[PDB]
């Protein structure tokens, strides 16, 4: 926060790696959610057929 210092390459690289890991985890969560969680079209169609 207050740091007059100079950042090392290793610290920055490790933070970048974990940030990318978190981003990939979020992307995979979105992937396995959309294909198995969220749906509107066919649900609406089956609801209309039942009605």
């Amino acid at each position: 926060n207050g740091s007059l210092l100079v950042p090392t390459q290793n610290a920055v690289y490790d933070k970048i790696v974990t940030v990318d890991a978190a981003i990939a985890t979020a992307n995979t969560n979105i992937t396995n959610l959309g294909t198995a969680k969220a749906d509107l079209s066919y649900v609406n169609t089956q609801l209309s057929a039942d009605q």
Binding site: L4, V6, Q9, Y13, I16
Partner: protein, 52 residues
Amino acid sequence: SYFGKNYISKSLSPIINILPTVTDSWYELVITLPESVSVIATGSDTAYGTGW
């Protein structure tokens, strides 16, 4: 002393041919300096590749 840095051995047992760079057997006291003095950061712009 090793390449301009000071390493204090911290192994409880004698160590031979163990380089000062090893964090397990050495401490590597980071040289405290006057932080007020604006030491210039020489930055080599050498286009790295995010795997180094």
